[PDB]
Short mmCIF file of C-alpha atoms in Angstrom, two decimals:
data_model
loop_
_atom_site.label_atom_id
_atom_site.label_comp_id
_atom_site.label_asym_id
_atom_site.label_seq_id
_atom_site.Cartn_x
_atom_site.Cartn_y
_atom_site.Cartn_z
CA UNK A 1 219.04 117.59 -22.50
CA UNK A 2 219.63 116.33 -25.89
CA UNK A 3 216.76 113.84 -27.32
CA UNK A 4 216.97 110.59 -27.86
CA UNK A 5 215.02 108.00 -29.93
CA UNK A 6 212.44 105.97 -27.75
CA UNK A 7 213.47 102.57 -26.26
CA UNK A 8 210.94 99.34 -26.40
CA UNK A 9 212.06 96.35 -24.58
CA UNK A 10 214.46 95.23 -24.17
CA UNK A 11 212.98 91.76 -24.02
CA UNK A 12 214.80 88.64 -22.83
CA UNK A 13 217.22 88.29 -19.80
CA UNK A 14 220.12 89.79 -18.13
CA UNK A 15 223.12 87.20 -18.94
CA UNK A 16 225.63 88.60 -21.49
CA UNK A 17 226.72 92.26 -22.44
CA UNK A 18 224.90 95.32 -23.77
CA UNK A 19 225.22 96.13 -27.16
CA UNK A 20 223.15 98.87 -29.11
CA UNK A 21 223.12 99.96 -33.09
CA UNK A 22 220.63 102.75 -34.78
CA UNK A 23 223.00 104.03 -37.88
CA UNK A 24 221.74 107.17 -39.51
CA UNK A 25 220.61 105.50 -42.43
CA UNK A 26 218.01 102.68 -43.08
CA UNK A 27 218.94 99.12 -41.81
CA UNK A 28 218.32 97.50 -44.77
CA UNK A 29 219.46 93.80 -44.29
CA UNK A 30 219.16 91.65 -41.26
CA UNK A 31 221.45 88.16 -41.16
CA UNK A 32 219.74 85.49 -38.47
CA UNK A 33 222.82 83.02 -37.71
CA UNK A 34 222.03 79.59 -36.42
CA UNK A 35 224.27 77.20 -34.42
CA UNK A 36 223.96 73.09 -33.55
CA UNK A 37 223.25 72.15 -37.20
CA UNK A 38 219.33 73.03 -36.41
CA UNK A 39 217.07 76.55 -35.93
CA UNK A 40 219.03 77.98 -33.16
CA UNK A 41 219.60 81.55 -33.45
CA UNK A 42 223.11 82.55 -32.03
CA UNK A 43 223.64 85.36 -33.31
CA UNK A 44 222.00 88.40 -35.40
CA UNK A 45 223.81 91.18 -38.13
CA UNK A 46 222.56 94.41 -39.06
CA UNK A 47 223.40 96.33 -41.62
CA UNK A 48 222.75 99.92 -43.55
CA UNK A 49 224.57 99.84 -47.02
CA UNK A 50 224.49 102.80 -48.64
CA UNK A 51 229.01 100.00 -50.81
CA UNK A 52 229.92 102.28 -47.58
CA UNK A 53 228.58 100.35 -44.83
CA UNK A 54 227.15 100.75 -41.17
CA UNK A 55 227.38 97.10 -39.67
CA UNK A 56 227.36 95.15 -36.24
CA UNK A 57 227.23 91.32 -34.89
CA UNK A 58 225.97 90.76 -32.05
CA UNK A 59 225.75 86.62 -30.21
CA UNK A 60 228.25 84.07 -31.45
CA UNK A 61 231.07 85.27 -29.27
CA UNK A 62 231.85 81.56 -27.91
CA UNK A 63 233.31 78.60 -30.08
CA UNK A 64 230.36 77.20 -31.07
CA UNK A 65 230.40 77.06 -34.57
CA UNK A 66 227.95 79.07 -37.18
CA UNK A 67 225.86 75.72 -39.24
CA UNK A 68 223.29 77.97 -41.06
CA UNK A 69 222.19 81.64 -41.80
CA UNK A 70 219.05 83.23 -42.81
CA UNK A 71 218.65 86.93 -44.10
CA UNK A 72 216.59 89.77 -44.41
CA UNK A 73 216.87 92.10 -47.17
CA UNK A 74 214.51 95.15 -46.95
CA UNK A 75 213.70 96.23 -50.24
CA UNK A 76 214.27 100.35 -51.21
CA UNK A 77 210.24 101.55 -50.01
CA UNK A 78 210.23 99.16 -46.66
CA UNK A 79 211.07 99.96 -43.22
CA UNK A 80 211.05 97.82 -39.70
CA UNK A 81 207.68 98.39 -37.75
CA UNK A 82 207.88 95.52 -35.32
CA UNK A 83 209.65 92.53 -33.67
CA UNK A 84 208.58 89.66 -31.71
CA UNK A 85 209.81 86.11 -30.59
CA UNK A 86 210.55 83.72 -27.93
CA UNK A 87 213.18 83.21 -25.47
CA UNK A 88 213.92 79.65 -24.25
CA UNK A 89 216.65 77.48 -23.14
CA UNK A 90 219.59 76.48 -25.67
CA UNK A 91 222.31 74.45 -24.51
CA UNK A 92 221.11 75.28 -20.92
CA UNK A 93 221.02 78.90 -21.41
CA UNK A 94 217.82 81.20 -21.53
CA UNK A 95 218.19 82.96 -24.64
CA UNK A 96 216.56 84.33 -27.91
CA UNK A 97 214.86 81.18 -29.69
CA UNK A 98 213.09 83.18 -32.58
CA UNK A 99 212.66 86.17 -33.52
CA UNK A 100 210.40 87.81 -36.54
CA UNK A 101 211.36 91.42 -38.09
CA UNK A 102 208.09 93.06 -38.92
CA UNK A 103 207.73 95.83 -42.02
CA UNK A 104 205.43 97.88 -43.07
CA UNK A 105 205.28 95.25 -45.72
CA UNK A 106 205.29 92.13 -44.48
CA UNK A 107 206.48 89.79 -41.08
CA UNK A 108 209.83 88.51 -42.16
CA UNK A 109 210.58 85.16 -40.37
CA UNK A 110 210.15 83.16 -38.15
CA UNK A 111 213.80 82.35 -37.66
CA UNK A 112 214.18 80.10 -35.21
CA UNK A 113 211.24 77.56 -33.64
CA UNK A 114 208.32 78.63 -31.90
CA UNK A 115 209.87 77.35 -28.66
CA UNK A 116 209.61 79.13 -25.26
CA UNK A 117 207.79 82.15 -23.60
CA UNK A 118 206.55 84.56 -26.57
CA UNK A 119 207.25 88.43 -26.68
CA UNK A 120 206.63 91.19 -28.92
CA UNK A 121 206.63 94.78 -29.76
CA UNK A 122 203.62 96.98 -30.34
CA UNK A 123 203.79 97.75 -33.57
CA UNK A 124 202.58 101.57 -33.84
CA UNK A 125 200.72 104.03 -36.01
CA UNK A 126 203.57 106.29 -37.90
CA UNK A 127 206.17 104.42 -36.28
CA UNK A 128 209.32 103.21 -37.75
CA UNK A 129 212.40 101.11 -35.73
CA UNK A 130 215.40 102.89 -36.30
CA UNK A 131 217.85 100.52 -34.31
CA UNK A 132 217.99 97.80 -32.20
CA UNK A 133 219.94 97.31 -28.79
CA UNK A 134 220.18 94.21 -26.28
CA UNK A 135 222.75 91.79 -24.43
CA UNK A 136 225.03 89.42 -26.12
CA UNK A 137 227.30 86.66 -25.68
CA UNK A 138 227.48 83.03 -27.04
CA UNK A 139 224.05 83.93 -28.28
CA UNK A 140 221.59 86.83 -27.58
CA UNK A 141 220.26 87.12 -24.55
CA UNK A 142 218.11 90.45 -25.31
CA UNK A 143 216.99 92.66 -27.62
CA UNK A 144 214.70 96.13 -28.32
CA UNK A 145 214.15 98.39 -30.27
CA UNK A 146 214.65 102.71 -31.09
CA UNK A 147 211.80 104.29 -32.59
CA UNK A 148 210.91 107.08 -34.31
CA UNK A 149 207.84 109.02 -35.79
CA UNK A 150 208.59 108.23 -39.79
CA UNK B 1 214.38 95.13 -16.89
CA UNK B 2 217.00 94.27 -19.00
CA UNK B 3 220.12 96.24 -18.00
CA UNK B 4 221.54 98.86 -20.36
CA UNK B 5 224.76 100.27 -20.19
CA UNK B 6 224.95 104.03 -18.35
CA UNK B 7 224.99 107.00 -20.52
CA UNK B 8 226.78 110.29 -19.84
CA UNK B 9 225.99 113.22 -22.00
CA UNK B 10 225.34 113.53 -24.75
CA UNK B 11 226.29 116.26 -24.93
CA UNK B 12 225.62 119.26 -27.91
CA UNK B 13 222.76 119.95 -29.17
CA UNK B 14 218.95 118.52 -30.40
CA UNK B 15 219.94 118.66 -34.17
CA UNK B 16 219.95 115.72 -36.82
CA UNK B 17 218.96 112.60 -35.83
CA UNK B 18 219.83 110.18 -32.99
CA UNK B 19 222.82 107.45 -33.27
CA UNK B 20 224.13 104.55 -30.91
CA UNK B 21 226.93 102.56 -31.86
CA UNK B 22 227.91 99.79 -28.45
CA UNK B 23 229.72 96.75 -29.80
CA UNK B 24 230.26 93.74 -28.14
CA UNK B 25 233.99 93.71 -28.38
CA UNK B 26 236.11 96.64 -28.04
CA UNK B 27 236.31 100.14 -30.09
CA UNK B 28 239.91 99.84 -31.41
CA UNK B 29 239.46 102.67 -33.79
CA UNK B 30 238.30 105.74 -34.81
CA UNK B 31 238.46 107.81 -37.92
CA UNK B 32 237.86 111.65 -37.81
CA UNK B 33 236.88 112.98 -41.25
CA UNK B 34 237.18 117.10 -41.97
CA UNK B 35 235.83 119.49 -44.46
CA UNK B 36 236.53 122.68 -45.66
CA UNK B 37 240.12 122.03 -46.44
CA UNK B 38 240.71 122.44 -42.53
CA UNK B 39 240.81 121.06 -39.51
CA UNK B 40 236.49 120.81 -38.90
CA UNK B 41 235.52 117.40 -37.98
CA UNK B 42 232.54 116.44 -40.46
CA UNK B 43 232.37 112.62 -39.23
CA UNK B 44 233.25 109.78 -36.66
CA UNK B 45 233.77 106.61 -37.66
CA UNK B 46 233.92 104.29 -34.39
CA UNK B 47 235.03 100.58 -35.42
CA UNK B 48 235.55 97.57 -33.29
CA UNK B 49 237.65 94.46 -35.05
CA UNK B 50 237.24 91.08 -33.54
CA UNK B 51 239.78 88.21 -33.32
CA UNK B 52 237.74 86.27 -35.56
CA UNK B 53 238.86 89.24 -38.48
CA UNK B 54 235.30 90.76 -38.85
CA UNK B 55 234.43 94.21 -38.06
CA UNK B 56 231.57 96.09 -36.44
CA UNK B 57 231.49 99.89 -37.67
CA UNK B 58 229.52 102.86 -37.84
CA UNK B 59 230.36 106.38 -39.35
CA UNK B 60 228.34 109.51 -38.01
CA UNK B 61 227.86 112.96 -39.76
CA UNK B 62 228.94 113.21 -43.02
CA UNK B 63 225.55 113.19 -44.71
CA UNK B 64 226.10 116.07 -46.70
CA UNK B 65 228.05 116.88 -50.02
CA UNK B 66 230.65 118.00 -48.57
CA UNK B 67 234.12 116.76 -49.52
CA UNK B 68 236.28 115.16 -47.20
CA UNK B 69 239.25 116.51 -47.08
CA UNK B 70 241.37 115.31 -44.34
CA UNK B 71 241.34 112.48 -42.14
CA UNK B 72 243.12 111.38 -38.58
CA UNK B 73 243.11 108.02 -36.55
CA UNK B 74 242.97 106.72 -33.41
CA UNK B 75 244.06 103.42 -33.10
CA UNK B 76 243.86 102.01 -29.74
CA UNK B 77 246.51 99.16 -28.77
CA UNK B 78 245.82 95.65 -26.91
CA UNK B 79 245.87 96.78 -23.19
CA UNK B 80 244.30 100.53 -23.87
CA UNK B 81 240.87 101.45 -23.76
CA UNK B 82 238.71 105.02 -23.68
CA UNK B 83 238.48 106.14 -20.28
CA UNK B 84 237.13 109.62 -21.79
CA UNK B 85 235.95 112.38 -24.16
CA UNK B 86 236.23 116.20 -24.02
CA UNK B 87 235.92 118.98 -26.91
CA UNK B 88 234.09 121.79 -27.91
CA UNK B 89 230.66 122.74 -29.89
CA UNK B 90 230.05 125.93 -32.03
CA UNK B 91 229.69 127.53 -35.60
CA UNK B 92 231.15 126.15 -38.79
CA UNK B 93 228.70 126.74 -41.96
CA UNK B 94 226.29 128.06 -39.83
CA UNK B 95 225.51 124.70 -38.44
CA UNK B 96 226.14 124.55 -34.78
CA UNK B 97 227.93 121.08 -34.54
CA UNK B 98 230.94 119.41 -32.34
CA UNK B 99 234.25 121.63 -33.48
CA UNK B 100 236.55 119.45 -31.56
CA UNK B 101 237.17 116.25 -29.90
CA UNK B 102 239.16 114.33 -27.60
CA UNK B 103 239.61 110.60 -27.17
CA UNK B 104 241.20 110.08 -23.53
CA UNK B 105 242.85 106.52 -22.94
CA UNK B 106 243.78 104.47 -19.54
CA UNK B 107 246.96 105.45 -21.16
CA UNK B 108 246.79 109.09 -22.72
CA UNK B 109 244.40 111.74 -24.36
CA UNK B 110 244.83 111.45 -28.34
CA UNK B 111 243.75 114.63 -30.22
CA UNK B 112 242.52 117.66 -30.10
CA UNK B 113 241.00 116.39 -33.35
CA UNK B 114 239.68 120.17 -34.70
CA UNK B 115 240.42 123.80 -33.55
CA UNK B 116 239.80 125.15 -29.69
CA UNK B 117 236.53 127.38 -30.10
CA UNK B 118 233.26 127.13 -29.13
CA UNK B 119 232.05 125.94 -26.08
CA UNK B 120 233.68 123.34 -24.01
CA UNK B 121 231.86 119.94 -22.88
CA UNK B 122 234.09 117.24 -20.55
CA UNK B 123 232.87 113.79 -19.36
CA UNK B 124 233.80 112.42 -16.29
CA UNK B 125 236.81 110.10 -16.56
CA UNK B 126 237.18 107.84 -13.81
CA UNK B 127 235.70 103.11 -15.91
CA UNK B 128 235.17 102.40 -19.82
CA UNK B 129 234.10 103.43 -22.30
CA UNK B 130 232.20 101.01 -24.11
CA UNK B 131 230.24 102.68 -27.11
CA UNK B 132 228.65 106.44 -28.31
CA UNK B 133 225.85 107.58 -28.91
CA UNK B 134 224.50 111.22 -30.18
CA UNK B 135 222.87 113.33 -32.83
CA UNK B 136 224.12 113.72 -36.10
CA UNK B 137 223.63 114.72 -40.01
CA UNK B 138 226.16 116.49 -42.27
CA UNK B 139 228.06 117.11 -39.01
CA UNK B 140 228.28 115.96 -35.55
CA UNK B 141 225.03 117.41 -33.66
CA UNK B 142 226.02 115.65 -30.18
CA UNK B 143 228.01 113.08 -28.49
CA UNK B 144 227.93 110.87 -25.46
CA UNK B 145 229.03 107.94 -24.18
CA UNK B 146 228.13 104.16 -23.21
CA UNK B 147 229.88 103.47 -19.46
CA UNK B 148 230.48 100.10 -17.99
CA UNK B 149 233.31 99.31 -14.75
#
């Protein structure tokens, strides 16, 4: 059997579809879309830019449209360690209200409100998040992470 | 829990490190990239382009200095979608990495992309798929596959 990188989470609910990302290279910017013209997240971007580019989108699949964006950009000697959040209702769904991206830096964030039941990962000694996977659909309705010993 | 999408495979080998690529919308492309002035696949490039013009992408292998020197596509029209993959693992540079690959359709297989040798690994087509996942660094360590019905 061929190895894998370990799973945490996913945390959140079971609406949407699955999506998953761990590029070879280092995530190294994070884009937090908001809808409603307030702190709703509705959709999240990863990236690895090495100008050649590893990328994915995952929420905003509906009409709603995009009113704000917040991003991430991990600098050259910082790496993902940790995420945590809360999932709560938006427009009568149960999805992600916040989310923070944890370095070994610094906690990035919050984006989003502290609304809703809380969750987090363990953040780990040696530990780096490689990836993230989740559901999707209007807006994310889960998310983990893929880990690996740094 | 949180349902995930089923994997089959991957299939190859424990070299490299791990990748997952499962967008939202569908994969409507993929780009093989060879070395060695010949028909070895060196990367996968798996891309998914969304009405709204933006795309999700990820290329696999091709970590090392090697030159590309070759590339073939796959694009995948409006009603097709991958059903399948098949192809072989074995020797080139001394690296023991995926030597050939095939993308099977609802509507067709499209390849081989890279020579017949080495040893021969088939998923079951039946079903989509929806994504990859596998090993990779200068080459293509392993491959498998995201399902959904």
């Amino acid at each position: 059997a061929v190895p894998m990188d370990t799973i945490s989470g996913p945390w959140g609910n079971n609406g949407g579809n699955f999506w998953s990302f761990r590029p070879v290279n280092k995530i190294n910017q994070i884009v937090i879309s908001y809808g409603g013209g307030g702190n709703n997240p509705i959709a999240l971007t990863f990236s690895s830019t090495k100008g050649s580019k590893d990328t994915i989108t995952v929420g905003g699949g509906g009409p709603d449209s995009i009113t704000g964006t917040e991003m991430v950009n991990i600098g050259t000697d910082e790496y993902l360690t940790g995420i945590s959040g809360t999932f709560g209702i938006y427009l009568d769904n149960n999805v992600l209200r916040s989310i923070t991206f944890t370095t070994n830096l610094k906690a990035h964030g919050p984006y989003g409100q502290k609304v809703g039941t809380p969750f987090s990962s363990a953040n780990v000694v040696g530990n780096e998040i490689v990836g993230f996977l989740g559901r999707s659909g209007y807006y994310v309705d889960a998310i983990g992470t893929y880990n690996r010993h740094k």
